[PDB]
From Swiss-Prot:
It catalyses: N(1)-methylguanosine(37) in tRNA(Phe) + pyruvate + S-adenosyl-L-methionine = 4-demethylwyosine(37) in tRNA(Phe) + 5'-deoxyadenosine + L-methionine + CO2 + H2O. Keywords: 4Fe-4S, Cytoplasm, Iron, Iron-sulfur, Lyase, Metal-binding, S-adenosyl-L-methionine, tRNA processing. Binds 2 [4Fe-4S] clusters. Binds 1 [4Fe-4S] cluster coordinated with 3 cysteines and an exchangeable S-adenosyl-L-methionine. The gene is taw1. The lineage of its organism: Archaea, Methanobacteriati, Methanobacteriota, Methanomada group, Methanococci. GO terms for molecular function: 4 iron, 4 sulfur cluster binding; metal ion binding; tRNA-4-demethylwyosine synthase activity. [4Fe-4S] cluster 1 binds at C26, C39, C52. Its main location: cytoplasm. This is S-adenosyl-L-methionine-dependent tRNA 4-demethylwyosine synthase.
Amino acid sequence: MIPEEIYKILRKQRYQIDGHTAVKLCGWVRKKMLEDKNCYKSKFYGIETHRCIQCTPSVIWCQQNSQIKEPKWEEPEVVYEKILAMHKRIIMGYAGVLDRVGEKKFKEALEPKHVAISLSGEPTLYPYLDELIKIFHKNGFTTFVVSNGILTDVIEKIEPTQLYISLDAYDLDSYGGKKEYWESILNTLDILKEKKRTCIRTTLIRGYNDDILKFVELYERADVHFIELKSYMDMLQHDEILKLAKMLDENSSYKLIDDSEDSRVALLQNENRKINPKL
């Protein structure tokens, strides 16, 4: 169901695939199992690294960024089982190091508690996203979803534990891309303040996104809970990420509260809608 050329690029990325769905074990998972080390997910939000699933219901289908037409989306309950089963397979690999990992951590990994729907493509294109999220919630999972915000309608209804909107551009022109899309993204932004828990993530790149203060108008407009400034990976270095985070902090309502060198990412918090980043 996927061009053998794209596939070999995904497998090379350690992607597990099944139909229009994919899952990948966060590179930080081994570090947790063996070295007992935690990732920025554990640092920013209190999520158990080894009990987190990274996935996506739409592997290679996304509007912005493509000649491949959308597939026959499978029902939510089947997407759910495919994700859990694919994650299980990777975690099965740790069976051979049980004497290193320990039965406690292995058992905990065989029973994930969090799921990040941010692996690849645009999650909202999957028509049964909302039901899928509700299913994960029904089974004890907290949910994090990342979206380009183009499909305002789908966002307004989904109720994940945390919703992310990736906003790598600050205006019509800076946005390839089509202006109609950006017209949809703005509406979405205007509704975000209504949701339980939001965050805008921006991946900056030299001479491309650096002018951080350019986002302030939108960041203030969106009026979200958190801002995540991340180094795309000439790629910005942590200190450059921290400095930029400082400028933002001194020119908006969002204040710097955390960061993670290992992942080159800074977390800012809406001074007006302060919620604990810890789940």
